[PDB]
Amino acid sequence: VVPVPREQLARSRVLVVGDVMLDRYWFGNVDRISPEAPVPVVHVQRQEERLGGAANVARNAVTLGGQAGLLCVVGCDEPGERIVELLGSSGVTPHLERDPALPTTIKLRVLARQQQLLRVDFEAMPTHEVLLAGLARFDVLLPQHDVVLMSDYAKGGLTHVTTMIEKARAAGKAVLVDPKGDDWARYRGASLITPNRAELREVVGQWKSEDDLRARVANLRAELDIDALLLTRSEEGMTLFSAGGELHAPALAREVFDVSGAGDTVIATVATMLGAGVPLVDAVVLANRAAGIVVGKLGTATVDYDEL
Amino acid sequence: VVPVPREQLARSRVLVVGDVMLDRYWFGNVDRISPEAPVPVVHVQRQEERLGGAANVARNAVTLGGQAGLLCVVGCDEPGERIVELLGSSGVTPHLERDPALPTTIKLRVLARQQQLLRVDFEAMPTHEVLLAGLARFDVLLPQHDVVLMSDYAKGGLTHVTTMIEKARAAGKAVLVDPKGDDWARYRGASLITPNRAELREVVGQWKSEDDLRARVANLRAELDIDALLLTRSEEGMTLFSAGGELHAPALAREVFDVSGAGDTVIATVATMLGAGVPLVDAVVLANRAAGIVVGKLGTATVDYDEL
Numbered sequence: 001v002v003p004v005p006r007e008q009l010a011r012s013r014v015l016v017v018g019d020v021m022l023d024r025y026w027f028g029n030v031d032r033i034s035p036e037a038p039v040p041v042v043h044v045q046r047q048e049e050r051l052g053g054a055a056n057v058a059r060n061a062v063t064l065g066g067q068a069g070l071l072c073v074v075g076c077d078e079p080g081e082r083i084v085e086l087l088g089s090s091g092v093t094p095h096l097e098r099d100p101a102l103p104t105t106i107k108l109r110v111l112a113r114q115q116q117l118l119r120v121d122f123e124a125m126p127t128h129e130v131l132l133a134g135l136a137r138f139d140v141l142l143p144q145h146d147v148v149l150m151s152d153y154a155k156g157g158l159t160h161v162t163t164m165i166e167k168a169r170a171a172g173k174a175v176l177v178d179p180k181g182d183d184w185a186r187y188r189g190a191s192l193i194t195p196n197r198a199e200l201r202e203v204v205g206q207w208k209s210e211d212d213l214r215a216r217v218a219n220l221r222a223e224l225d226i227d228a229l230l231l232t233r234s235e236e237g238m239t240l241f242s243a244g245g246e247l248h249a250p251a252l253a254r255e256v257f258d259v260s261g262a263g264d265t266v267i268a269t270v271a272t273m274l275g276a277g278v279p280l281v282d283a284v285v286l287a288n289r290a291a292g293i294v295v296g297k298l299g300t301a302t303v304d305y306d307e308l
Numbered sequence: 309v310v311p312v313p314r315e316q317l318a319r320s321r322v323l324v325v326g327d328v329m330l331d332r333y334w335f336g337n338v339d340r341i342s343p344e345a346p347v348p349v350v351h352v353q354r355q356e357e358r359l360g361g362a363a364n365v366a367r368n369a370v371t372l373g374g375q376a377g378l379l380c381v382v383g384c385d386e387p388g389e390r391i392v393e394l395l396g397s398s399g400v401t402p403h404l405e406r407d408p409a410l411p412t413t414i415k416l417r418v419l420a421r422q423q424q425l426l427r428v429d430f431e432a433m434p435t436h437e438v439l440l441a442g443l444a445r446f447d448v449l450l451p452q453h454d455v456v457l458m459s460d461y462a463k464g465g466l467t468h469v470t471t472m473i474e475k476a477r478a479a480g481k482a483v484l485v486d487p488k489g490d491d492w493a494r495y496r497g498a499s500l501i502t503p504n505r506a507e508l509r510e511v512v513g514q515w516k517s518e519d520d521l522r523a524r525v526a527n528l529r530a531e532l533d534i535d536a537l538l539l540t541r542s543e544e545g546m547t548l549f550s551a552g553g554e555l556h557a558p559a560l561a562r563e564v565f566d567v568s569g570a571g572d573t574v575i576a577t578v579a580t581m582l583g584a585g586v587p588l589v590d591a592v593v594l595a596n597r598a599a600g601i602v603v604g605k606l607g608t609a610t611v612d613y614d615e616l
């Protein structure tokens with residue numbers, strides 16, 4: 001595949017819609033047991049923070065060169081303000097709906113001796129009032145973007161996916177979906193869906209061989225008005241499923257330092273590439289390289305233009 | 309003992325010096341295991357908050373009728389602001405030194421199914437610059453109060469106890485000490501110290517009988533220039549140790565709903581009573597009633613005038 005000009009990518013606008021969350025980590029050391037309970041006492045020494053969820057996908061799109069918008073719901077609190085800060089410095093254009101009764105989604109980790117002890121989640125269901133308000137935003141935001149990326153983490157911000165998809169398709173805009181859950185009936189209409197071997201395992205069912213691979217997946221592309229599926233197989237690489245054939249893209253880089261964030265990087269690349277007017281086949285390759293590279297770096301890591 | 313007029317108590321000023329901390333609780337429910345670690349996932353549904361440490365002792369003094377000042381160190385953060393809020397609405401006069409490099413002391417509990425899972429502490433050692441600044445405050449605050457209460461929780465805010473005590477004694481002010489630790493050499497000069505049966509057990513050593521009780525404790529009152537010791541024995545009640553005799557004060561109320569906060573209530577009462585010009589023997593009794601009553605209520609609970 002031929003490289004893509006820096007001016008082309010700079011024109012690429014991606015509308016990322018889904019669930020944003022703040023990844024927070026508490027590194028401390030335990031030396032004693034609580035006087036009131038048979039539980040350890042973590043004396044926190046350090047906190048690390050990073051954008052997670054749909055925010056991470058939008059972050060990857062920017063570094064590659066393209067522009068990125070982020071439609072999502074955030075609470076009226078400190079974590080909400082932190083996401084706003086992190087977004088502004090990451091170059092992502094925020095389009096946030098505020099729900100004071102909603103806690104900003106947080107996945108907090110508590111660690112000691114380089115291992116986890118407990119995970120703490122702050123999250124709730126966004127009100128119908130807020131969901132429709134954001135849907136109104138989507139109508140205004142849709143014509144301003146080249147391609148739409150649905151980032152689902154099942155936190156509630158993607159209740160109206162079916163309608164959002166149908167709108168973007170009606171405008172000739174492609175719809176990409178990073179899924180979550182065993183039920184994908186909500187995702188009908190999508191241009192492309194991007195599951196793992198495991199994400200697809202517990203929905204299409206357990207299977208046999210690579211010829212039977214097409215046998216089930218092509219049926220799934222029929223069950224739901226879904227044009228293509230990109231199956232990320234780690235070791236084996238990944239395979240696109242068009243209606244006019246297939247494509248394989250195995251491993252590329254040679255570092256398995258950290259897997260986290262690889263999936264988010266993949267779908268973010270395809271979106272940004274498509275927005276710049278790049279063929280789907282070529283876009284899949286660029287997502288594979290981006291994937292391969294970020295594995296040689298810690299969690300939320302990003303491939304920029306020069307690395308491609 | 310004869311009751312004490314509401315006007316008398318209203319005149320009583322108590323200077324509480326020590327470690328303040330925010331007691332925070334996270335009530336949630338766990339339903340799954342973290343995908344990245346063999347640890348539970350707590351989805352928090354509720355947070356409860358209350359003043360802890362020296363702040364709680366100062367809170368008890370106010371409700372009884374007396375005035376209360378609180379000299380302590382607090383960080384420049386959200387928890388710090390919360391303590392300031394809680395203090396203002398609790399009627400306690402704040403005298404706070406701010407250390408931006410110091411986290412406001414927090415003891416966070418994480419609960420599920422009505423039981424603890426983990427305890428999380430945020431705390432650090434106050435700088436020498438901050439400690440001396442607060443000591444300068446103490447010099448200004450000492451002449452404005454009737455009696456001084458040292459509330460130690462070994463968080464660092466009581467590094468200069470020995471000097472503070474010597475100053476208050478030199479002004480004819482009584483010094484009360486709620487201790488913490490096996491080493492009490494810092495507490496020399498004190499008018500009164502208030503340990504548990506357990507708090508004294510691991511410092512005076514294990515012992516035999518009630519006559520041997522005086523044998524060791526009277527030696528301790530000699531080792532350190534300490535006039536009196538108030539030994540809280542729960543079931544057996546409590547016993548004051550003057551140089552001119554002893555006194556016993558057994559159980560009074562008939563509810564053991566919750567023990568937490570009972571000790572803080574005891575020493576806070578003696579201080580406030582002494583400040584109003586009440587004999588030490590009488591002050592000990594009023595602390596026993598206050599103790600007995602608060603046991604019939606949840607943790608940080610307070611006896612006001614009418615209950616005495």
Ligand SMILES: O=C(O)COc1ccc2sc(CNc3nncc(-c4c(Cl)cccc4Cl)n3)nc2c1
Pocket residue numbers: 196232233234235236237238249250251252253256259262263266288291292293295
């Ligand atoms: O399991 C998950 O939760 C995410 O699953 C993913 C995410 C991203 C990708 S990108 C991909 C194809 N490209 C590629 N290139 N170099 C290295 C790897 C790789 C990874 Cl990434 C993990 C383990 C082993 C390898 Cl060899 N993969 N497969 C996935 C699967």
Ligand SMILES: O=C(O)COc1ccc2sc(CNc3nncc(-c4c(Cl)cccc4Cl)n3)nc2c1
Pocket residue numbers: 504540541542543544545546557558559560561564567570571574596599600601603
């Ligand atoms: O163990 C601790 O950490 C604190 O230790 C304390 C704190 C406060 C007091 S006040 C006291 C004498 N008065 C009194 N009156 N009614 C009930 C009780 C009581 C308590 Cl409070 C707990 C358990 C059993 C009883 Cl019968 N006690 N002994 C202590 C000891």
Ligand SMILES: [K+]
Pocket residue numbers: 258259260261262294295296297298299300301
């Ligand atoms: K990574």
Ligand SMILES: [K+]
Pocket residue numbers: 566567568569570602603604605606607608609
């Ligand atoms: K209590």
